[PDB]
Amino acid sequence: TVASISSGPKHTQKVPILTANETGATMPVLPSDSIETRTTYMHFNGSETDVECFLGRAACVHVTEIQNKDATGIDNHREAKLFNDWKINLSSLVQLRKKLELFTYVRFDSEYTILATASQPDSANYSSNLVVQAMYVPPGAPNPKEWDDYTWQSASNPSVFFKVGDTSRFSVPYVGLASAYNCFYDGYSHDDAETQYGITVLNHMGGMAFRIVNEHDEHKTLVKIRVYHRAKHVEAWIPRAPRALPYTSIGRTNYPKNTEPVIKKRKGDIKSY
């Protein structure tokens, strides 16, 4: 492939460099339309800019935490972090979010990796070996109420059991209700006067509940869960302007008030170098 062809002096009536940008086109002008060039080859394919590659590496999408401790006398397991749920999202930690929102609709399978590490912040004789249970709870399933409910039987709901310190990995097909996930949605769920704007089920990817299977030892053990997400089989439509201001909320476009100028001011003139 040639990156530049050889081209010499020109004295024409045919001027490729004068255009009318009002038309909305970006005319494909090249170095050889306005200087004299020599042949050179590309030596490159643009492999690593493919959208499959761009969205295809694992990104941290969620960090939560649960603890193993005596539940005796706990009136609210959920509240003691005896167990914890997470409604899956890709817009809570901003790194991956800005990447996805370069597109309007996106379609892909997900590969999840879940790393779990334990901490024992206060005096323990040892490090126990805990098994985590991660249950995938689709909308309409009974939700766990205690850390050892009938729910955890999970007879119809996919669940994975792995050890703290290890990693669990499985992949979920594209679960969207429509043909693509909406990265944006300028609508409501119905014509209600007060219903929420922008947040939609069109994006919904399920939800996940974590708990330790082990009963309690004498000390307490903090287990912190990190969920990583990798898109595989990516398809993206309609590019948009990149995110400039900071994010404030999952699912709305809102930016913070009295934010700071995002364009760097010159130290000098327009004329400055």
């Binding site: 255009t19 086109a25 594209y174 595989k232 089989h233």
Partner: protein, 40 residues
């Protein structure tokens, strides 16, 4: 070799090697030729 039955379980896809910027760079209704005048 796929070891698994479902398609979601296969590895990453392989390069589009599609590439056609004209839907974005030249969505004009009447075709513009480089070198010919923009507005006639």
């Amino acid at each position: 070799i796929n070891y698994y039955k479902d398609a979601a379980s296969t590895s990453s896809a392989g390069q589009s090697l599609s590439m056609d910027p004209s839907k974005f760079t030249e969505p004009v209704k009447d075709l513009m030729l480089k070198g010919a005048p923009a507005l006639n």
